[PDB]
Amino acid sequence: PLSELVERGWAAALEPVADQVAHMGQFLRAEIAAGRRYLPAGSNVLRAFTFPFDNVRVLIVGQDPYPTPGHAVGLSFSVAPDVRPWPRSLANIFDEYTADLGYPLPSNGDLTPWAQRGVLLLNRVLTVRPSNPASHRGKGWEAVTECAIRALAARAAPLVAILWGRDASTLKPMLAAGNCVAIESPHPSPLSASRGFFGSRPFSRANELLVGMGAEPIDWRLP
Ligand SMILES: O=c1cc[nH]c(=O)[nH]1
Numbered sequence: 001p002l003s004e005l006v007e008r009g010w011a012a013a014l015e016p017v018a019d020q021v022a023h024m025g026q027f028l029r030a031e032i033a034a035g036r037r038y039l040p041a042g043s044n045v046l047r048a049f050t051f052p053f054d055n056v057r058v059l060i061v062g063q064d065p066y067p068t069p070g071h072a073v074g075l076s077f078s079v080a081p082d083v084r085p086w087p088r089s090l091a092n093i094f095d096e097y098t099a100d101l102g103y104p105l106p107s108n109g110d111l112t113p114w115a116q117r118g119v120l121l122l123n124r125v126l127t128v129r130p131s132n133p134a135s136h137r138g139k140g141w142e143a144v145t146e147c148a149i150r151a152l153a154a155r156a157a158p159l160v161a162i163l164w165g166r167d168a169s170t171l172k173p174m175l176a177a178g179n180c181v182a183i184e185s186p187h188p189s190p191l192s193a194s195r196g197f198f199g200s201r202p203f204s205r206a207n208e209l210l211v212g213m214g215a216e217p218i219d220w221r222l223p
């Protein structure tokens with residue numbers, strides 16, 4: 001049951017899609033039975049929902065997990081600490097991190113500290129077939145992650161949304177019910193690079209927006 005898979009707040013928030021989450025478990029088992037693989041590891045698929053729902057203050061949305069074996073870890077854009085070199089998307093994120101915040105380059109690609117601090121690193125689709133980008137689109141995850149985003153937007157708490165998966169016209173309606181939701185626009189993605197992403201100041205703007213809504217800023221600093 002959801003209560004065993006995710007954090008208590010998320011289990012309640014995702015109750016309307018509990019049957020669909022069970023169906024995705026069936027889908028993944030059927031993939032292995034059919035001789036196909038999936039990433040991330042089963043134990044990491046729902047990892048973004050293992051950090052507390054009530055404490056989320058920034059939503060960073062991606063589209064699909066990394067398709068390269070050993071990259072996807074269940075937090076959008078993150079990689080395991082032993083992964084090197086970083087994927088291009090993450091290298092671009094880190095360049096912006098250094099430019100926006102003035103911090104040196106991180107030691108590795110693990111974004112766990114952001115998750116701990118209330119940054120929800122959510123992909124719209126939570127699995128992928130290795131080496132086959134975007135291969136699990138339309139398999140059932142979109143309803144689950146829509147429920148998640150709508151539940152976040154309905155909280156009385158502040159939220160800043162950062163849209164790094166394009167798809168803004170799909171996502172913005174999900175964030176509309178919100179009373180204390182600010183969406184960063186425009187919506188370059190990390191691979192936009194110098195055609196809008198670099199200089200987008202997503203981290204410092206998120207903090208400016210949070211503080212303007214009466215919330216504490218995120219400490220973005222990575223080790
Ligand atoms: O959208 C994206 C792109 C790369 N990696 C992710 O986890 N999400």
Ligand SMILES: [Cl-]
Pocket residue numbers: 035036037038129130
């Ligand atoms: Cl495969």
Ligand SMILES: [Cl-]
Pocket residue numbers: 087088089090
């Ligand atoms: Cl990439």
